[model samples]
Target chain A: EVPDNPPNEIYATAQQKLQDGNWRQAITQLEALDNRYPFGPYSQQVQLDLIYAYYKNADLPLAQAAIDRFIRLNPTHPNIDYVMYMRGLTNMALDDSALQGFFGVDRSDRDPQHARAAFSDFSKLVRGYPNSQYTTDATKRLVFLKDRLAKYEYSVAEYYTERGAWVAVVNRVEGMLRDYPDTQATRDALPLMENAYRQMQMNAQAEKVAKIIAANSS
Target chain B: KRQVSGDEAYLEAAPLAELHAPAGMILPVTSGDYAIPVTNGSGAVGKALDIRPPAQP
Candidate 1:
């Protein structure tokens, strides 16, 4: 049925499938339309809809590939912000696993994999297109992503402390506070740094950290 | 019978199986490389040592 269909016919069916939330069917139709009319009237729209369909169908890798192709081909495209946001969304999904807790979060202790990629994508979106429509949502996600990154650094500091790696703990704590401030991790990190100093008999450094903690003790 | 909760959700209920000892070379305990060399910590760290991540939204 698709082999004989013209671009308009295929694209209409593709749009209908998208409207019905049938991502698999939309992918099937959109993919054929894209193949038949690479430079056709609906070329750009086909790419965008195909990327979205892949994302909705849980085809993250395919979505990412299509997104990259669109961005690489049309860096100044009008809907570039939307494509950038989808890249971040796809990577964010790739970062998470099914091993979640009852409260709705990943319970595993492993370091995040693709979160940094998503963070970079979102960061670029917010920075490059300050007036873009997606900037607000992208900026909001950047906040949560920054918090998550800081939390990971905090976890590494704790791991170092668990084995009594005092020097390692202090360094890790320093990096966490230096790179990502204003998080709860920043507040919690001062104490960990002071403890590491005392463990290593660096009383002067410990007193300095203690003073900082006391000054901010609210 | 009852609902499983927390991390126990990762484990599924199954029929019990009999234990079997293999007639092979003995495996050495590698726990030494993994032991907590330091004494039990004190102060804030002692109470805060946990692998659980930050609370989620």
Candidate 2:
């Protein structure tokens, strides 16, 4: 058992600084509290609130690491969603093009893949707490991300299709089907693939593809 | 003394029995205009709205 920090001034100072949004100073005071009372109850909980400070200050990586450490230390904390949601917020911070741009990452460079990761973290939050209060917001974000993924896929497919690469067109369309079937991209893709196949004079292959769509529709 | 919006807003769920039906002299609505019976056939039914003088008056 770790020694308890005898109740003293540091915890009070930390709480005051935290309320004032002096996050760096609050972290300093909290760190002292933890050192003085290594196994203290408030020590663990204070460190958990430190994660919230890192998040509000837009310090993405720090917040994420703090959340990870808290989860590792307290695997069965009843209110784990509070911290999980913080971790999700950090993931979103990294994907936030406006913030990323302020820090010098090009918006286009950070747009596609990081966005998917942010969406995945939110989805995991939903799976863990399906009836959670956050579920409605998570569902809306998922819809937005799925549409963005579909539009990106459609652009790539159009790039290949215009080059008369019928095979590449099929591959890109299939990628969209796998990654983001919710976008109206599927509606456009069937005709695009059919047109490409007909251009290539692959009549039998075109017929087979057409029949697949028909069967799925019914 | 009361003003009402010219739009319909859902108030409460009513059972089929509580929904008003047309009088006997008027032909009841056929499934044809909406074809709710034919296409997209299983969800909600719309009640007809008729405004006329009451027969007894």
Candidate 3:
């Protein structure tokens, strides 16, 4: 017979399944635990393990939902950092498939939706949990992600330039200036900014950034 | 009533009884701050995540 009431062994067995390196059954087993005690003592741990198990099974989308659900219920969860760290990592995984498919059908790049989301998740991790155990790794990720995001904007501007979208280039570069200045991408972008302004006959502003470009020219 | 401490597990949450409005009356959606505004707090605990202790890096 199936369980009508929560049993200690139900959780115990599910735990062992993960220890036994069998992800699929553990996901199923954990779901069983979920309905048995939807609001019972093991529910929180069950949710956490479900995300971990989903991640191990390479079910990225489902894992992302589970992480959000966990955060929704427990905003101040004892292990929010652990769950937030997982959230960031899950988004990174989603960003991977996002690009791989683009490589198959595109001549060039596509907008990455998850990269910024992952950056937000990891950014909050370090900001909120200044001394969290995950903060060190999260900080390093933030550093690389900042550069990556800056370059994404730069390349998008480059693409628009190829198609004669000077206005789009100017506005896009303005956004880059606000959000991602001081990166190598911004260093490369100054000329585009200057060129777009000059093309638009805004020489007043054109000279403005020209001085900035010259300052960094050395 | 479930013969367990429900608060700790959030099982104590029960559906509110439906209100029988007047025969000609329309019920308004109950207005309240159902969504909790986010706050600026870390509010973390430093215990190991899982039952089994995590390995040191």
lDDT of 2 by residue, A1-218 (tens): 32254645667776677778677787777767766777765756676757766666667788778878888988876667656655655665565555554686534323477657756766776667665444544444555555555666777778788788988897777665555443565546766777778888999767765764664453
All candidates: TM-score of chain A: 0.94, 0.77, 0.86
Clashes of 2: 0
Number of the top-ranking candidate, with TM-score as the measure: 1
The CAPRI quality class of candidate 3 comes to incorrect
After TM-score superposition, what is the CA distance of residue A172 in candidate 3 from its true location, in Å?
Answer: 1.4
Tens-digit lDDT track for model 3 on B1-57?
101110121112222222233333332344221111133333322232222212221
lDDT of 1 by residue, A68-142 (tens): 999888868767777887888788777666645345774224566577787788788766776655565555455
Docking class of 1: incorrect
Clashing residue pairs found in predicted model 2: none
Clash totals for all models, in order? 0, 0, 0
DockQ of each: 0.01, 0.01, 0.02
The models' CA-based lDDT, in order, is 0.66, 0.56, 0.66
